[PDB]
């Protein structure tokens, strides 16, 4: 053939953005600081999933066709010892691309700044959910976090950050999740206990025993 060259893709495939400084500061705090009960990261992620499931469960009352992307409201947890990943998948309402960028990169500024002020005044890490920013507690155990999300009104997107002050967002051309959010935790070397499922059960039973949706473990 010839050697055509595509000088210009139609649209930027991957976009990289900086966190608001206060979000980056909290992430650095979380990822570098000792905490005696890091298992609370799972409670915070399950709590976000439960809220997203509540959200779609409500809108299904007005519009039952919002469930055409999936009728089951559930949470699945998948440890992968060979990849050192722990994955949380929910069939909640999901996030549009705009809300993915805004919620994780920008408007968490107020909660993260108030939480750091509370920490300086004597609060501790386990209170992070009272400031609406419990998601960042993932970096207690993870060196890298991927968020895959699909909202009925938008396309499936992938967010990722290793807490170096920036994150990337891209169209996800991967396994389609239908609707909801998938959080993939790339675990730190010394936190692989959360790949053992005797441990994961322990943590769910301790912290999330009264979530109103089924939690299934895959191993
Ligand atoms: C990345 C993190 C913040 C997260 C987001 C969602 C999500 O898609 N939301 C959460 C929420 C809450 C209230 C209304 C709508 C939505 C939409 C989720 O299901 C799980 C997590 C795992 O921590």
Residue numbers in the entry: -1 to 217
What's the publication's text?
Based on this data, substituents at the 4-position were investigated to determine selectivity and affinity against Hsp90β in silico. Additional derivatives of the 4-position were then prepared and included the 4-methoxymethylene and 4-formyl moieties. Introduction of the smaller 4-formyl group led to both improved selectivity and affinity for Hsp90β (Kd = 310 nM versus 1.55 μM, ~4-fold selectivity); however, the 4-methoxymethylene-containing compound (3) did not bind either Hsp90 isoform at 10 μM. The binding modes of 2 and 4 were revealed by solution of the co-crystal structures bound to Hsp90β at 1.9 and 2.4 Å resolution, respectively. Examination of the co-crystal structures revealed an alternative binding mode for appendages at the 4-position, as the formyl and cyanomethylene appendages adopted a conformation wherein these moieties orient toward the back of the pocket, instead of the predicted forward orientation. While an increase in affinity was observed, modifications at the 4-position did not produce increased selectivity.
